Design a protein around this ligand. Sequence first.
Ligand SMILES: Nc1[nH+]c(Nc2cccc(Cl)c2)sc1C(=O)c1ccc(F)cc1
Ligand SMILES: [Cl-]
Ligand SMILES: [Cl-]
Ligand SMILES: [Mg+2]
Ligand SMILES: [Mg+2]
Length: 298
Amino acid sequence: VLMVGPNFRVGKKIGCGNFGELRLGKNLYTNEYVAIKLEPMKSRAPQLHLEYRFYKQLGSGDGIPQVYYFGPCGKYNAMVLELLGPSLEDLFDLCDRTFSLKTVLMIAIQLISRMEYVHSKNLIYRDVKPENFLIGRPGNKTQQVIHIIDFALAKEYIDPETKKHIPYREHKSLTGTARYMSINTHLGKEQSRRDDLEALGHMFMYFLRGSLPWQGLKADTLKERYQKIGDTKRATPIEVLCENFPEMATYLRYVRRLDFFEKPDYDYLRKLFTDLFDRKGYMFDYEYDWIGKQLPTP
Ligand SMILES: Nc1[nH+]c(Nc2cccc(Cl)c2)sc1C(=O)c1ccc(F)cc1
Ligand SMILES: [Cl-]
Ligand SMILES: [Cl-]
Ligand SMILES: [Mg+2]
Ligand SMILES: [Mg+2]
């Protein structure tokens, strides 16, 4: 209908993909634009309410969009959240699908921290991809901040009653994004903190190279395609994938070698990147490759 909750006017379909799942909204009470995620109540695979619950568990955080409302909107459930800027994928395309090392480091430094924050709230993310990292909007003074969105695939990796890390197990069906997922995800292993960080590594390399070497693989079934991609990830030495980027190689073999239950040393990983960053004479000034270009809106 026209409205979500007391005060959010539902506007136009925005973004690409979606199929009507994302709308511009306006808080009429505050004169502020918002994002409205819509999910048909009839959905055979509802994710929006579990996503909302993950956001509540995350709480208020750096680079975590504010969530304003969850509730019904006609024959949809709606989640009203902070309107953010373009995704890293949008911005990657805008920058001819390569980012400079400086840009990738400024992103990486933030997203290690972004991931550590998620992990500190007993969540694993499990959906790393450039599309789920958005800059803010100029209006919010957070346009420089890389935000993380899309927690539908997240999982509590610390059992809230037992306070124990989730058990190791396998034969987990593959669903996520094949391109960035960890080698262990490919093998059907339960994802843990290491996997979010490894997927980050892959994405970092994607940004630096402009592509990953398993990116073009096709198969008659999803399972075969996941298999071939995982096979290629296993067959591609880190040294080769991360040629010219030794710290990336170091990051990637460290996160690859993490035990299932292990707390990553986020400090260590950040320091690999901030040491490199300083060594290259980069200044952390948020002058990303896309700055000065014509960004998509909202
Ligand atoms: N919080 C925001 N903010 C967004 N801003 C936005 C939307 C379309 C284009 C641009 Cl440039 C920015 S998208 C979004 C979001 O949660 C989202 C992204 C993709 C999607 F399929 C559903 C929701
Ligand atoms: Cl940060
Ligand atoms: Cl610089
Ligand atoms: Mg905020
Ligand atoms: Mg998604």
